[PDB]
PDB file of C-alpha atoms and ligand atoms in Angstrom:
ATOM      1  CA  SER A   1       1.628 -16.487  23.432  1.00 38.95           C
ATOM      2  CA  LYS A   2       3.076 -19.472  21.565  1.00 38.71           C
ATOM      3  CA  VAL A   3       5.357 -17.914  18.922  1.00 37.28           C
ATOM      4  CA  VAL A   4       6.830 -20.175  16.228  1.00 36.54           C
ATOM      5  CA  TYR A   5       9.286 -18.826  13.615  1.00 36.34           C
ATOM      6  CA  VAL A   6       9.441 -20.910  10.396  1.00 38.78           C
ATOM      7  CA  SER A   7      12.801 -20.439   8.655  1.00 37.15           C
ATOM      8  CA  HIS A   8      13.687 -21.618   5.133  1.00 34.69           C
ATOM      9  CA  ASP A   9      15.192 -25.061   5.798  1.00 35.21           C
ATOM     10  CA  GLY A  10      11.945 -25.846   7.697  1.00 34.22           C
ATOM     11  CA  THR A  11      13.559 -25.422  11.157  1.00 33.38           C
ATOM     12  CA  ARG A  12      11.272 -23.768  13.785  1.00 35.11           C
ATOM     13  CA  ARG A  13      11.707 -21.852  17.088  1.00 34.32           C
ATOM     14  CA  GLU A  14       8.810 -21.771  19.589  1.00 34.45           C
ATOM     15  CA  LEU A  15       8.984 -18.937  22.199  1.00 35.84           C
ATOM     16  CA  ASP A  16       6.666 -17.243  24.650  1.00 35.53           C
ATOM     17  CA  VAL A  17       6.073 -13.563  23.745  1.00 34.83           C
ATOM     18  CA  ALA A  18       3.961 -11.632  26.290  1.00 32.52           C
ATOM     19  CA  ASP A  19       1.534  -8.775  25.599  1.00 31.95           C
ATOM     20  CA  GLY A  20       3.133  -5.688  24.032  1.00 31.31           C
ATOM     21  CA  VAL A  21       6.389  -7.508  23.183  1.00 28.09           C
ATOM     22  CA  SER A  22       7.135  -7.436  19.441  1.00 28.97           C
ATOM     23  CA  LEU A  23       8.385 -10.645  17.796  1.00 29.39           C
ATOM     24  CA  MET A  24      11.615  -8.736  17.114  1.00 28.17           C
ATOM     25  CA  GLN A  25      11.874  -8.063  20.870  1.00 30.48           C
ATOM     26  CA  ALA A  26      11.563 -11.681  22.117  1.00 30.21           C
ATOM     27  CA  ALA A  27      13.716 -12.838  19.162  1.00 31.11           C
ATOM     28  CA  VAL A  28      16.537 -11.008  20.989  1.00 29.86           C
ATOM     29  CA  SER A  29      15.835 -12.888  24.244  1.00 26.92           C
ATOM     30  CA  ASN A  30      16.147 -16.296  22.545  1.00 21.13           C
ATOM     31  CA  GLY A  31      18.865 -15.036  20.194  1.00 21.07           C
ATOM     32  CA  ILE A  32      16.961 -15.242  16.861  1.00 23.65           C
ATOM     33  CA  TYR A  33      17.130 -11.780  15.211  1.00 23.77           C
ATOM     34  CA  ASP A  34      20.858 -11.446  16.155  1.00 24.58           C
ATOM     35  CA  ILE A  35      21.409  -9.061  13.222  1.00 26.63           C
ATOM     36  CA  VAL A  36      20.936  -5.557  14.698  1.00 25.19           C
ATOM     37  CA  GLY A  37      18.069  -3.375  13.381  1.00 30.91           C
ATOM     38  CA  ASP A  38      18.184  -0.292  11.124  1.00 32.74           C
ATOM     39  CA  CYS A  39      14.912   1.440  12.097  1.00 36.88           C
ATOM     40  CA  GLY A  40      15.652   0.080  15.585  1.00 39.92           C
ATOM     41  CA  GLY A  41      12.264  -1.562  14.966  1.00 40.33           C
ATOM     42  CA  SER A  42      10.476   1.750  14.237  1.00 37.00           C
ATOM     43  CA  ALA A  43       8.850   0.472  11.011  1.00 34.17           C
ATOM     44  CA  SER A  44      11.285   2.086   8.542  1.00 35.98           C
ATOM     45  CA  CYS A  45      13.568  -0.687   7.198  1.00 35.31           C
ATOM     46  CA  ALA A  46      13.391  -4.093   5.489  1.00 35.61           C
ATOM     47  CA  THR A  47      15.609  -5.687   8.139  1.00 36.71           C
ATOM     48  CA  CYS A  48      12.620  -7.500   9.728  1.00 34.99           C
ATOM     49  CA  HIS A  49      11.116  -8.676   6.399  1.00 38.08           C
ATOM     50  CA  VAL A  50       9.100 -11.817   7.340  1.00 40.09           C
ATOM     51  CA  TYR A  51       5.871 -13.580   6.334  1.00 40.96           C
ATOM     52  CA  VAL A  52       3.279 -13.795   9.145  1.00 41.05           C
ATOM     53  CA  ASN A  53       0.616 -16.534   8.778  1.00 40.89           C
ATOM     54  CA  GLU A  54      -2.400 -14.760   7.212  1.00 40.15           C
ATOM     55  CA  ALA A  55      -4.299 -16.004  10.315  1.00 38.47           C
ATOM     56  CA  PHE A  56      -2.733 -13.577  12.852  1.00 38.94           C
ATOM     57  CA  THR A  57      -2.169 -10.623  10.491  1.00 39.65           C
ATOM     58  CA  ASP A  58      -5.880  -9.724  10.529  1.00 39.69           C
ATOM     59  CA  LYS A  59      -5.890 -10.170  14.322  1.00 41.65           C
ATOM     60  CA  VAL A  60      -2.643  -8.522  15.527  1.00 40.03           C
ATOM     61  CA  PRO A  61      -2.275  -4.692  15.213  1.00 40.40           C
ATOM     62  CA  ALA A  62      -2.045  -4.302  11.421  1.00 43.30           C
ATOM     63  CA  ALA A  63      -0.355  -0.895  11.219  1.00 42.32           C
ATOM     64  CA  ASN A  64      -2.018   1.835   9.139  1.00 41.91           C
ATOM     65  CA  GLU A  65      -0.785   2.731   5.612  1.00 44.11           C
ATOM     66  CA  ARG A  66       2.527   4.048   7.000  1.00 41.40           C
ATOM     67  CA  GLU A  67       3.960   0.511   6.694  1.00 41.58           C
ATOM     68  CA  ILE A  68       2.120  -0.392   3.459  1.00 40.30           C
ATOM     69  CA  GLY A  69       4.590   2.028   1.796  1.00 36.97           C
ATOM     70  CA  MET A  70       7.601   0.457   3.547  1.00 35.11           C
ATOM     71  CA  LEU A  71       6.320  -2.981   2.596  1.00 35.25           C
ATOM     72  CA  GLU A  72       6.899  -1.746  -0.969  1.00 35.30           C
ATOM     73  CA  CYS A  73      10.588  -1.219  -0.070  1.00 38.32           C
ATOM     74  CA  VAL A  74      11.888  -4.806   0.559  1.00 37.03           C
ATOM     75  CA  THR A  75      14.236  -6.894  -1.669  1.00 39.23           C
ATOM     76  CA  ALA A  76      12.263 -10.154  -1.216  1.00 39.64           C
ATOM     77  CA  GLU A  77       9.003 -11.411  -2.781  1.00 37.10           C
ATOM     78  CA  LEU A  78       6.280  -9.383  -1.052  1.00 36.36           C
ATOM     79  CA  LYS A  79       3.178 -11.274  -0.022  1.00 36.65           C
ATOM     80  CA  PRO A  80      -0.438 -10.058   0.356  1.00 36.24           C
ATOM     81  CA  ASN A  81       0.108 -10.716   4.076  1.00 37.75           C
ATOM     82  CA  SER A  82       3.758  -9.540   4.242  1.00 36.79           C
ATOM     83  CA  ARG A  83       4.770  -7.791   7.478  1.00 35.37           C
ATOM     84  CA  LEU A  84       7.659  -5.932   9.191  1.00 37.42           C
ATOM     85  CA  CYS A  85       8.135  -8.105  12.318  1.00 34.43           C
ATOM     86  CA  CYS A  86       9.141  -5.086  14.492  1.00 36.89           C
ATOM     87  CA  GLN A  87       5.841  -3.211  13.934  1.00 38.18           C
ATOM     88  CA  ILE A  88       3.915  -6.171  15.477  1.00 37.01           C
ATOM     89  CA  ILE A  89       2.751  -6.770  19.107  1.00 33.99           C
ATOM     90  CA  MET A  90       2.152 -10.322  20.385  1.00 33.96           C
ATOM     91  CA  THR A  91      -0.581 -11.230  22.901  1.00 34.57           C
ATOM     92  CA  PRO A  92      -1.505 -14.369  24.915  1.00 34.75           C
ATOM     93  CA  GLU A  93      -4.908 -14.486  23.175  1.00 35.82           C
ATOM     94  CA  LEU A  94      -3.153 -14.754  19.774  1.00 38.79           C
ATOM     95  CA  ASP A  95      -1.081 -17.715  21.033  1.00 37.42           C
ATOM     96  CA  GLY A  96       0.087 -19.950  18.123  1.00 40.17           C
ATOM     97  CA  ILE A  97       1.242 -17.223  15.682  1.00 34.68           C
ATOM     98  CA  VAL A  98       3.388 -18.847  12.927  1.00 32.12           C
ATOM     99  CA  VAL A  99       5.994 -16.506  11.329  1.00 30.50           C
ATOM    100  CA  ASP A 100       7.728 -17.347   8.023  1.00 27.83           C
ATOM    101  CA  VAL A 101      11.236 -15.854   7.590  1.00 27.33           C
ATOM    102  CA  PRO A 102      12.888 -15.986   4.070  1.00 27.44           C
ATOM    103  CA  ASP A 103      16.570 -16.286   3.115  1.00 25.69           C
ATOM    104  CA  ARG A 104      16.468 -12.668   1.844  1.00 25.06           C
ATOM    105  CA  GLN A 105      15.382 -10.417   4.718  1.00 28.25           C
ATOM    106  CA  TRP A 106      17.385  -7.434   3.463  1.00 29.84           C
TER     107      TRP A 106
HETATM  108  S1  FES B 201      13.037  -3.806  12.070  1.00 29.46           S
HETATM  109 FE1  FES B 201      12.981  -2.013  10.782  1.00 29.46          FE
HETATM  110  S2  FES B 201      11.072  -2.296   9.712  1.00 29.46           S
HETATM  111 FE2  FES B 201      10.989  -3.871  11.253  1.00 29.46          FE
END
C-alpha cells in the first residue's frame, strides 16, 4: 500500500505498509513516529493524533465508538475525519492513503 505522511512544513514520506500493519507500525520501520507510544497503540492516547484523508477513513477499519470518545481527548483541532493512527490497519487495496500530521500531536 502506498502510504504518504503529510507533515506541517509540507514535507512527505511515502512507505509501503502491508495488510494488517498499522501506520504507526511501519512508521517505526522508516523511523517516522520515533516518539514512543502511551497506549502502546491500543487506542487510548492522543500520541498518534493525525488527520487521515477523508478518502481512506470510510474505507479502512473505522473503529467503533470506543475511539470516538478518545478522539474527544486530544489537544489539537479535531476534524470530522480525525483518527488515532495506531487504531488503523493498512491494506494493498487502499494503496495511496494520505495522512496529515499536525505540529501538536500531544
Ligand atoms: S498511539 Fe495511542 S491512541 Fe494511537
